[PDB]
UniProtKB/TrEMBL annotation, chain A:
Positions of Mg(2+) 1 binding: 24
Cellular compartments annotated: Mitochondrion inner membrane
Domain of life from the UniProt record: Eukaryota
Function summary: Produces ATP from ADP in the presence of a proton gradient across the membrane.
Protein name, per record: ATP synthase subunit beta
Family of the protein in this entry: Belongs to the ATPase alpha/beta chains family.
Subunit annotation: F-type ATPases have 2 components, CF(1) - the catalytic core - and CF(0) - the membrane proton channel. CF(1) and CF(0) have multiple subunits.
From TrEMBL, chains B, D:
Protein name as annotated: ATP synthase subunit alpha
Ranges for domain ATPase F1/V1/A1 complex alpha/beta subunit nucleotide-binding: 1-141
Role summary: Mitochondrial membrane ATP synthase (F(1)F(0) ATP synthase or Complex V) produces ATP from ADP in the presence of a proton gradient across the membrane which is generated by electron transport complexes of the respiratory chain. F-type ATPases consist of two structural domains, F(1) - containing the extramembraneous catalytic core, and F(0) - containing the membrane proton channel, linked together by a central stalk and a peripheral stalk. During catalysis, ATP synthesis in the catalytic domain of F(1) is coupled via a rotary mechanism of the central stalk subunits to proton translocation. Produces ATP from ADP in the presence of a proton gradient across the membrane.
Lineage: superkingdom: Eukaryota
UniProt binding sites for ATP: 137
Binding site for Mg(2+) 3: 44-45
Ligand binding (Mg(2+) 2): 44
Family under the similarity heading: Belongs to the ATPase alpha/beta chains family.
Compartments, as annotated in UniProt: Mitochondrion inner membrane
Organism field: Polytomella sp. Pringsheim 198.80
From TrEMBL, chain C:
Subcellular location: Mitochondrion inner membrane
Descriptive protein name: F-ATPase gamma subunit
Keyword Membrane attached: yes
Domain of life: Eukaryota
Record membrane topology: Peripheral membrane protein
Gene: atp3
GO cellular component: mitochondrial inner membrane; proton-transporting ATP synthase complex
HAMAP family assigned to the protein according to its UniProt record, in alphabetical order: ATP_synth_gamma_bact (MF_00815)
SUPFAM superfamilies: ATP synthase (F1-ATPase), gamma subunit
MF terms in GO: proton-transporting ATP synthase activity, rotational mechanism
UniProt entry keywords in alphabetical sequence: ATP synthesis, CF(1), Hydrogen ion transport, Ion transport, Membrane, Mitochondrion, Mitochondrion inner membrane, Signal, Transport
């Protein structure tokens, strides 16, 4: 999702024009950080997620 | 704007900034309280302050509790809201009115932070989404 | 949130037995109304083999009675014959005639002003409080004698069986205004009978039409009372099924929330204990 | 059986074997997918594979989530079911068709693993129990 934002932010900031940024399941970013954060040595937050959600 | 201060620790800002933003705004409003004037502090989404404090305390390896909130999350909101006082005449007689905003999930006031700040504050303006869509707006239950 | 579902379960659990109680109450009422309707069906036979059945007459003034229910738990009774007294009152008026709307029942005056309010004149209620007798039926017959139409219209759900409620029309012709006028078929079809009465044929016909309207009105509000009890017995059987299926959904949702509550509280205890050890 | 491979990890076998048997079966059918042939695979009760992986995760002292499942129990099934593909003309043209089986509890199609595999697979064949108990078999909703 950050790569998609960087490709969009070059158009917004440098090129200076309207863009459309469609993201399919931005939930998967949060869920992937929840899968990563289980192993990074952290106490888990509410229903099982990362503390830095 | 000529009467309003706008303290904004936003979502990209770090969790200690969203933790210490209502204390910042309350200390700014305490200037008008302590000088005889009147203030109106509005802590918008005190629940998001509690979420930022939960992150900041879970990463400090402090043991979590109910909804993974720490023990002192009652004290977090109580020691902030009790700074909204109507001072006596020997201290200028100034005042401070606090308006904490709490977001609940499907009308559940039996949640942790919701029960804390309900028991802390004086009143409650309880708004419903089933009266909001019946045309009754402001949606005051 | 978790306290809403467990209290709502008890709400639907008492509703599902309240409506079953009212269902068996309706069945026990139908069981004694079944002998009264069979005692009172037979008196409409001699008048209809004497006066016929003349619905589509050239009446200049007409009076319609819709015999509806008082209580409001019938389930497709008072609104069915509301549509029948709509479509039948489409049919009689074909020459710009006057038609007076009468209805019997609290659910009839609240369902017949929606379509015909300026044509509404009379509403009768509180009729089945204790029982039905010829006194009150004759009295509301006199209140239709306060009008003077050329014919009368009756609408009521005839208790054929406990499942079929045929909305029967009964048309009652005013005697010397229309009844002998409709019987002049190669002479007059009524003149085969020899009048034994104290006065002329018009006056015995007047007394006869008053008695005929009174007895068909008594039969109408007994047939409709028994089909009311039958329809409430049927509609509080379909409603018990709905409040049993909603309770079957709510118990499953409560058990899902119960298991999720124990898993959530357990995970919170485990995370808090493993933060220390 | 002339065309079928049977990869059996029963209830007595240890939970890493039941965790691994969909991947062994999918490797054995990716053989046929990669060389231009066509494969069908039936992961019978992926719900029991997720139960086996929940056992492996909680015995590794990993933090659980919804229904005490690990956070990567979606990745467990999506890593497996993404290998069922229709390959291009440059890659042989072979295909692999997967039939995951998921057991719900009381028609609860909105459980965690059920909604996980629903958002992975292309279709859905929902078999109702009440059509089944009325003689209508296959009980297709």
């Amino acid at each position: 999702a950050l790569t998609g934002l960087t490709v969009a932010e070059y158009f917004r900031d440098i090129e200076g024009q309207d863009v459309l940024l469609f993201v399919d399941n931005i939930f998967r970013f949060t869920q992937a950080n929840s899968e990563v954060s289980a192993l990074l040595g952290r106490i888990p937050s509410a229903v099982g997620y990362q503390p830095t959600l | 704007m000529r009467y309003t201060i706008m303290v904004s620790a936003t979502a990209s800002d770090a969790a200690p900034l969203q933790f210490l933003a209502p204390y910042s705004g309350c200390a700014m409003a305490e200037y008008f309280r302590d000088t005889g004037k009147h203030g109106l502090i509005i802590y918008d989404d005190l629940s998001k302050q509690s979420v930022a404090y939960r992150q900041m305390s879970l990463l400090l390896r402090r043991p979590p509790g109910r909804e993974a909130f720490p023990g002192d999350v009652f004290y977090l909101h109580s020691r902030l809201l009790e700074r909204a006082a109507k001072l006596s005449k020997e201290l200028g007689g100034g005042s401070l009115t606090a308006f904490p905003v709490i977001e609940t999930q499907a009308g559940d006031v039996s949640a942790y932070i919701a029960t804390n700040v309900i028991s802390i504050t004086d009143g409650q303006i309880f708004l419903e989404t089933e009266l909001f869509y019946k045309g009754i707006r402001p949606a005051l239950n | 949130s978790n306290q809403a579902v467990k209290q709502r379960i008890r709400a639907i659990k008492n509703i599902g037995k309240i409506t079953k109680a009212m269902k068996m109450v309706a069945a026990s009422k139908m069981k004694n109304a079944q002998i009264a309707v069979e005692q009172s069906r037979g008196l409409v036979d001699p008048f209809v083999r004497l006066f016929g059945d003349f619905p589509a007459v050239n009446s200049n003034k007409s009076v319609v009675v819709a015999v509806t229910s008082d209580k409001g738990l019938c389930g497709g009774l008072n609104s069915n014959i509301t549509k029948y007294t709509r479509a039948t009152l489409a049919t009689t008026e074909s020459e710009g005639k006057d038609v007076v709307v009468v209805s019997i029942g609290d659910k009839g005056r609240s369902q017949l002003t929606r379509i015909e309010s300026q044509r509404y004149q009379l509403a009768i209620a509180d009729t089945y409080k204790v029982r039905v007798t010829f006194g009150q039926a004759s009295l509301i017959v006199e209140e239709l004698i306060k009008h003077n139409p050329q014919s009368y219209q009756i609408l009521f759900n005839k208790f054929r069986s406990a499942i079929s409620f045929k909305p029967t029309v009964a048309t009652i012709l005013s005697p010397d205004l229309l009844e002998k006028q409709l019987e002049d078929v190669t002479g007059n079809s009524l003149d085969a009978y020899d009048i034994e009465a104290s006065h002329e044929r018009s006056d015995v016909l007047r007394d006869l039409t008053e008695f005929h309207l009174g007895v068909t009105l008594y039969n109408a509000m007994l047939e409709n009372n028994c089909s009311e009890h039958a329809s409430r017995m049927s509609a509080m059987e379909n409603s018990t099924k709905s409040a049993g299926e909603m309770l079957g959904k709510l118990t499953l949702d409560y058990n899902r929330k119960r298991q999720a509550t124990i898993t959530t509280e357990l995970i919170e205890i485990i995370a808090g204990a493993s933060a220390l050890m």
